[PDB]
Write a protein that binds this ligand. Sequence first.
Ligand SMILES: Cc1nc(-c2ccc(Cl)cn2)nc(NC[C@H](NCCCCc2ccccc2)c2ccccc2)c1Cl
Ligand SMILES: [Co+2]
Ligand SMILES: [Co+2]
Ligand SMILES: [Co+2]
Ligand SMILES: [K+]
Length: 304
Amino acid sequence: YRYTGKLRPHYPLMPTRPVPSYIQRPDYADHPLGMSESEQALKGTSQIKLLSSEDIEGMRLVCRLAREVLDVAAGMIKPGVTTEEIDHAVHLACIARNCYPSPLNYYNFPKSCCTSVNEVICHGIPDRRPLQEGDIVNVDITLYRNGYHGDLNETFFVGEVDDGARKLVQTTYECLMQAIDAVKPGVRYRELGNIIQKHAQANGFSVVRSYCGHGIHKLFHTAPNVPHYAKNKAVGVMKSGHVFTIEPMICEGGWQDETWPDGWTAVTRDGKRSAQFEHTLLVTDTGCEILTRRLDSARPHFMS
Ligand SMILES: Cc1nc(-c2ccc(Cl)cn2)nc(NC[C@H](NCCCCc2ccccc2)c2ccccc2)c1Cl
Ligand SMILES: [Co+2]
Ligand SMILES: [Co+2]
Ligand SMILES: [Co+2]
Ligand SMILES: [K+]
């Protein structure tokens, strides 16, 4: 394998961390290959679930808790801290909230959250590498509670960053928020990618094509599929009661990705930087409810 940039994996990984048996598990937690029986039963299906009142309540609670856990991660972003230490703190923060960390053993994923530094687009595996000043780093959190998953991500600055970092992170955030702004019943899911790409393209950046936003509730990933690039052919129309994510991955250079021999880590083919943001949204009559918003602060961590 020829690495696309300077980043390398830092092994060995610590033994996987157990989740105490009192915390409710998703079906895949104990499947040997980490397969989700309830997801695979609905594979290849465009049909979007419409959430009941108790579904909505369950989605509200878990996305609130997921935010709390991301805020925990954010507080630890500094030079010399390893992504593995972030993951350990994340893992304990999920347990304290009586939640299962959804990434853990998801299709055998080894860790409790995804940490994506610089050229890693998404799905970075927490490891022994100390964060370096100048780095940007995305932490993507999902929690599982009483049957429901809640999912969000933010990109952070590691100490002081160069001007290109500031710009890429800002634009990425702007892309997310412009797409959230257009969410309301009757809007086509395929339109969000037109908005995202138009904004990224205007700022000299490209949009990753191989990963998408997703529906989420009792399933971690399900219908709808939500591309972040223009002229995509996404199937579906937004409706009051739909719950899904927008999670645009935006690149300094070109849009193309490939995966490390670990089966998970997705990196730019040119080794330039990528940034990402994610909220889980609920479609309402006025627009959408941002289930994963910060409740006690106006902005994402990179601003404050
Ligand atoms: C954004 C995103 N993230 C993930 C993801 C998975 C694991 C971790 Cl640790 C972090 N993120 N998985 C995703 N999708 C997984 C997905 N699975 C959803 C359920 C389908 C069940 C199924 C049936 C047969 C073969 C594969 C999958 C899928 C599988 C194959 C092609 C596209 C998407 C997505 Cl969209
Ligand atoms: Co993912
Ligand atoms: Co996520
Ligand atoms: Co997601
Ligand atoms: K990154």
